[PDB]
Ligand binder design. Structure first.
Ligand SMILES: [Zn+2]
Lengths: 247, 247
């Protein structure tokens, strides 16, 4: 009620499940009972290594239909490098313009980021869920604590910790944020992932194609260290990247 | 001799010591018995975080005088990100032009790099010492083995290992390269170093100034995790970054 209309009314720890969605068609495969989807906002910079990245008109279609189906929506904007953007006076207005787009145009519920500066700006100036991506390689209590202090609401651990009770427990002892695990994700223990994710961060942001067989120098270098196993009971949230056939 | 001039003539495990040199004046403080200096080649991209970076005309002066004094010389070109350079057809010729400059104009003895692609090109096409920088964050036998396979001659461990006999030993069991330790360097365990080194990699390469008090967003975030302690007996080479007052 209200002060002139008095009213008396009377009357969450299940694992929350998020699915990557890279296309309008991919959305149809998300399980009906899922809590939300994570959608790459390609042109703003994505470090996560994917089979395909949606164009802006696709993102907007995905988000509309997902909300119709009652799914929460997070934007994946987890670039690990933005070049010299932060050094120019234009950098801050450009960043705020991008976050306004996410918050007020797309109207996402949260944002999955890696860059500590974005964590800080999002937490300070917006009212979105701030999720630290696994591409930030948070693998220690110390790293988790600093991301919490900058304003993270949720921290995705590096996938190397996905079955590690001792190390996840050490992080829980230190921070109060929710912890997420990414399934089908590459661990920073991979010898070249750091560099390859920097490359895709720029490719997506700048609209420069990366073709696995033509111009990615990291593609022939190794078998990527993907982590498929997980102990879900250690985590508050599960984020499924690869669910089946690639989009 | 030679086949027509027959000749009979008759008749190294001490720790090798390298010093960072950021200016012509800094060179005068290098100990006389040092094995070599490491000089940032700023305009080609440096991730190591320094008080000052020499301009190209300074680099050439430093290298000349260092050779006069019988010091070996390595170029520090350890950027962790080159943006989209590798994606364009121009990228490979640009890279070879840069390495030709190091090999044939400056005539350095070696190059300290982070990018796995540069390791591979340097080892395949040139006859320089290929040193993996501590900014590549090699902290495991697995990571060391992949950099060796790509062609590293020397691997600088992540500074978190500088006093860790067990972990350095595990790396030695796996690889045959020389191992270097960096003293006065930041460990990748630092919560934001990854991102800050990406930023400086671009700033130096692109000639965009970074002022600690005006436009580095990572500067106010934390006390950097610098490693000062070392167990030199674990390493083949010692690289001193900070020797005294900053250049
Ligand atoms: Zn970059």
């Amino acid at each position: 009620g209200s002060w002139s209309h008095p009213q008396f009314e009377k009357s969450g720890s299940m694992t929350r499940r998020w699915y990557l969605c890279c296309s309008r068609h991919h959305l149809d495969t998300v399980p009906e009972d899922s809590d939300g989807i994570v959608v790459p906002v390609t042109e703003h910079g994505v470090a996560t290594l994917l089979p395909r990245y949606p164009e802006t008109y696709e993102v907007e279609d995905i988000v509309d239909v997902a909300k119709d189906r009652g799914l929460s929506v997070q934007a994946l904007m987890d670039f690990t490098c933005a070049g010299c953007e932060h050094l120019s006076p234009d950098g801050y207005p450009s960043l705020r313009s991008t976050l306004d787009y996410l918050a007020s145009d797309l109207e996402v519920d949260g944002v999955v980021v890696a860059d500590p500066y974005l964590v800080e700006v999002l937490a300070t100036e917006y009212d979105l869920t701030v999720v630290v991506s696994h591409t930030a390689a948070v693998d220690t209590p110390e790293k988790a604590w600093h991301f919490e202090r900058l304003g993270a609401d949720v921290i995705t651990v590096d996938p190397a910790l996905n079955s590690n009770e001792e190390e996840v427990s050490a992080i829980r002892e230190r921070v109060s944020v929710e912890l997420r695990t990414a399934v089908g994700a590459i661990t920073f223990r991979d010898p070249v992932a750091f560099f390859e994710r920097n490359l895709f961060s720029h490719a997506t942001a700048e609209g420069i194609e990366v073709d696995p067989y033509r111009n990615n120098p990291y593609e022939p270098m190794r078998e990527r260290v993907v982590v498929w196993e997980v102990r879900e009971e250690l985590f508050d949230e599960v984020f499924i990247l690869a669910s089946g056939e690639p989009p």
